[PDB]
Amino acid sequence: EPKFTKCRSPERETFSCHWTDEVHGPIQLFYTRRNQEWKECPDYVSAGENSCYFNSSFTSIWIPYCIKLTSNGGTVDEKCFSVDEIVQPDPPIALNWTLLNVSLTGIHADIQVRWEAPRNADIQKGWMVLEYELQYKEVNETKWKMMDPILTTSVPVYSLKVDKEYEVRVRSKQRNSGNYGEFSEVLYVTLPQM
Amino acid sequence: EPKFTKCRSPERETFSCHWTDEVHGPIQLFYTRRNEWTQEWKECPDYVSAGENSCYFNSSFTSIWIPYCIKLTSNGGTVDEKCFSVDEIVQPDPPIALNWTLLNVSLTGIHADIQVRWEAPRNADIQKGWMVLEYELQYKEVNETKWKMMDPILTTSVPVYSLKVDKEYEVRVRSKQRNSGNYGEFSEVLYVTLP
Amino acid sequence: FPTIPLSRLFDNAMLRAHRLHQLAFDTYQEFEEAYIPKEQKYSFLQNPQTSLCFSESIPTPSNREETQQKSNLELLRISLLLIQSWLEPVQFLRSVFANSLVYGASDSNVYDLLKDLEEGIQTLMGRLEDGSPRTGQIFKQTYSKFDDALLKNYGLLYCFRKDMDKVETFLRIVQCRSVEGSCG
């Protein structure tokens, strides 16, 4: 049913909006950088099936935008936002881990998990300053244990039972603005009986 | 023959040039700025204040973004000339009040995580925007040769991870003006003994 | 509709000011230790042919004491005119930036940051109505103009490094006064 879903800016430089209208007439996107006159969607195709891609030239981080989705004249959904409000950065690339050591008891171990920034933050720098939230749980536990949001691409995980299989996933966010992106590919950490 | 060592602005407000004693003739310092210019040479305003073999321009003789030229004279002859600008010569003081806190202990009993914290140098006006400092923490175990260096911190508190309990470490930190080539001297060393 | 708060407004402008200054600094310093000896670094500063910057037509504070006696609309205006003054002259650093190992230094990239930071300061002049009688000097819009080649390029690059340091300082002074809890 012809409503908005998500406008998302992956780096703080571009963005797009999505909706639902995959049979459920012509839907159109309309925008205005608030400062009445609507411009219309610049590129209804680069993001695919039900999208509108606002590129570099069309995206300014100093003004609020508004958008109304017009299904054959009628406005169905409409929404205003600003670009830091819709920053939702790509998950981290290439997680791994290292075995620090095991106890005398042999019951527990200490690992360290590294990851690597999304490619589109490298490119940026001094614009897009990321913070990572690592969470982990046992392969058959239920609630994820979360860790404090760290700015580094490495955090140790302590007290893991040497023969219990584990899942580690980390997600990212811009330093105080926007909200979290999706999670990384989930690492499966398995500790050897040493 | 006397020679210049270093000139240095600590807080981007005052500065001082220092030289070596190598004739005793009288060694004197003469300066000029482009705020006339290279024919309006004036002697060091304050030979005592920054200690011996020094000249010290205070808050009222300093301007940044203006080129200064400096000349040293032994019994009137020149041994060194030197030109620079004060915004180019910032080399801030070391951070003060280095302290720490336990953050986490692994159930293996082998690794701890501490949080180190510190206050900025007392004369660096970070509070009203005339400076912005960047810190560099360094730690190593007191029986290790290589110092682990940290990737420049913008905040006065850092956590350092996977410290060993049964060892003792020493930490040492230095300030920098954001976007400049300096780093001051390190701070007083902090020995962290775990417990 | 949403207002973007002054807090974020200032915060993004300092990302830009700081990247512009970090770019001018690193690019200048690698050019210097490859092509300028101290012999020449001094000869340059010494002699006005190679010392004055076209940006100097704009009155700017020189020390802390003068800087803090300026208003928020004056510091933002001096800041705007210094950025507007580099919009065309960064073209002449194309040849120096193309051979720079500094990621990010390119006439097209640096012009983009100067153009974005320019919109920001204008956005900040529209929010910050903080008393200032709008008059004469500084409210005359003299964006500064610009009239061997190794020293030509070192002069442009010496003045970019500095004017970016001025823009970065001047925006931080007004963020520190406008947005409490920014600096402490």
| Helix-strand-coil split of chain A, %, nearest 5 | 5, 45, 50
Last residue of a domain, one of A37, A65, A89: A89
**B108 and A108: CB-CB below 8 Å?**
yes
Could you tell me the strand order of the sheet in which A145-146 lies?
Answer: A145-146, A130-138, A166-174, A187-189
- Strands of A74-165, DSSP E: 74-81, 93-102, 108-116, 130-138, 145-146, 154-161
Per-window interface: A 72-111 vs B, CB < 8 A? 100-103, 108-110
Q: What is the CATH number of domain C1-184?
A: 1.20.1250.10
Question: Is the domain of A94 the same as that of A181?
Answer: yes
Selected residue of C8, C125, C127 to mutate for chain A interface (largest A Cβ count, 10 A):
C8
DSSP, collapsed to helix, strand or coil, labels residue A120 as helix
Tokens of C56: 């100097």
**B179 and C21: CB-CB below 8 Å?**
yes
Question: Is the domain of A63 the same as that of A119?
Answer: no
Maximum distance among all Cα pairs of chain A, rounded to whole angstroms: 73
Residue B133 CA to residue B128 CA, distance in Å, equals 13
Are the beta carbons of B20 and B5 closer than 8 angstroms?
Answer: yes
- Residue numbers of the domain that contains A63: 1-89
What is the number of domains present in chain B?
2
Tokens of C18: 């700081």
Are the beta carbons of B159 and B103 closer than 8 angstroms?
Answer: yes
Question: Is the domain of B131 the same as that of B157?
Answer: yes
> Residue B69: which of C46, C166, C184 has the nearest Cβ?
C46
Are the beta carbons of C138 and C59 closer than 8 angstroms?
Answer: yes
Element spanning A171, H or E: strand A166-174
CA distance, residue B175 to nearest chain C CA (Å): 16
**C62 and B35: CB-CB below 8 Å?**
yes
Q: Give me the residue label for tokens 């705007």.
A: C80
Last residue of a domain, one of A70, A89, A108: A89
Q: Between C6-35 and C107-127, two packed helices, what is the crossing angle to 10 degrees?
A: 150
Residue A3 CA to residue B24 CA, distance in Å, equals 87
End-to-end CA distance of chain B: give it in Å, rounded: 55
CA distance, residue B37 to nearest chain C CA (Å): 9
Per-window interface: C 120-149 vs A, CB < 8 A? 120, 123
B163, B162, B161, B188: which is closest to B173 by C-alpha?
B188
Question: Is the domain of B60 the same as that of B105?
Answer: no
Q: Give me the residue label for tokens 């050591």.
A: A101
Question: Is the domain of B119 the same as that of B83?
Answer: no
DSSP string, chain B: ---EEEEEBSSSS-EEEEE-------EEEEEEE----TT--EE-S-TTTT-TTEEEE-TTS--TTSEEEEEEEETTEEEEEEEEEGGGSB-PPPPEEEEEEEEEE-TTSSEEEEEEEEEPPTT--TTTTS--EEEEEEEEETT-SSPEE---BSSSEEEEEEEETTSEEEEEEEEEESSSS--------EEEE--
Nearest chain A residue to B104, by CA: A158
Beta bridge partners of B16: B8, B56
Last residue of a domain, one of A55, A89, A123: A89
- CB burial readout A133-168, b (16+ within 10 A) else e: bbbbeeeeeeeeeebebeeebbbbbbebebeeebbb
- Chain B partners (3+ C-beta pairs within 8 A): A, C
To the question of whether residue C168 is assigned a binding role by annotation, the answer is yes
Question: Is the domain of B178 the same as that of B125?
Answer: yes
> Which is it for the CA torsion A71, A77, A80, A86, positive or negative?
negative
Resolution (angstroms) equals 2.8
CA distance, residue B184 to nearest chain A CA (Å): 24
**C51 and B35: CB-CB below 8 Å?**
no
A180 in C contact zone (CB under 8 Å): no
Q: Work out the number of other CB atoms within 10 angstroms of the CB of residue C137.
A: 9
B94, B86, B156, B97: which is closest to B127 by C-alpha?
B156
Are the beta carbons of B133 and B101 closer than 8 angstroms?
Answer: no
**A126 and C123: CB-CB below 8 Å?**
no
Torsion of CA B69, B74, B78, B80, to 10 degrees: -60
Question: Is the domain of A83 the same as that of A1?
Answer: yes
Q: Give me the residue label for tokens 């925006």.
A: C171
Q: Provide the 8-state DSSP code for A89.
A: P
Question: Is the domain of A19 the same as that of A95?
Answer: no
Question: Is the domain of B12 the same as that of B67?
Answer: yes
To the question of whether residue C18 is assigned a binding role by annotation, the answer is yes
Are the beta carbons of A51 and A18 closer than 8 angstroms?
Answer: yes
Q: Give me the residue label for tokens 């994820």.
A: A144
Chains A and C: how many Cβ contacts under 8 Å?
A: 42
Residue C95 CA to residue A70 CA, distance in Å, equals 49
Q: Work out the number of other CB atoms within 10 angstroms of the CB of residue A83.
A: 24
| A41-A44-A49 Cα angle (round to 5) | 140
Domain boundaries, chain C: 1-184
Q: Provide the 8-state DSSP code for A68.
A: E
Length of chain C, in residues: 184
> Residue A177: which of C3, C8, C116 has the nearest Cβ?
C8
Selected residue of B4, B58, B155, B179 to mutate for chain C interface (largest C Cβ count, 10 A):
B179
Beta bridge partners of A51: A18
**A126 and C19: CB-CB below 8 Å?**
yes
**B83 and C46: CB-CB below 8 Å?**
yes
**B129 and C162: CB-CB below 8 Å?**
no
Beta strands B77-85 and B67-74 are antiparallel
Nearest chain C residue to A80, by CA: C1
Question: Is the domain of B98 the same as that of B119?
Answer: yes
Looking at residue A154, which CATH number applies to its domain?
2.60.40.10
- CB burial readout B79-92, b (16+ within 10 A) else e: bbebbbbbbbbbbb
Torsion of CA B69, B74, B80, B82, to 10 degrees: -20
* Alpha-carbon distances of B128 from B87, C144, C182, rounded to whole Å: 18, 28, 9
Beta strands B190-193 and A74-81 are unpaired
- Chain A partners (3+ C-beta pairs within 8 A): B, C
Are the beta carbons of A138 and A165 closer than 8 angstroms?
Answer: yes
A117, A113, A114, A101: which is closest to A159 by C-alpha?
A101
Q: Work out the number of other CB atoms within 10 angstroms of the CB of residue A128.
A: 22
Residue A148 CA to residue A128 CA, distance in Å, equals 19
Question: Is the domain of A68 the same as that of A130?
Answer: no
Which one-letter amino acid corresponds to residue A14?
Answer: T
Question: Is the domain of A50 the same as that of A77?
Answer: yes
DSSP, collapsed to helix, strand or coil, labels residue C17 as helix
Length of chain A, in residues: 194
HSE, side-chain direction, 13 A CA sphere, residue B193? 0
Are the beta carbons of A55 and A10 closer than 8 angstroms?
Answer: no
Are the beta carbons of C113 and C19 closer than 8 angstroms?
Answer: yes
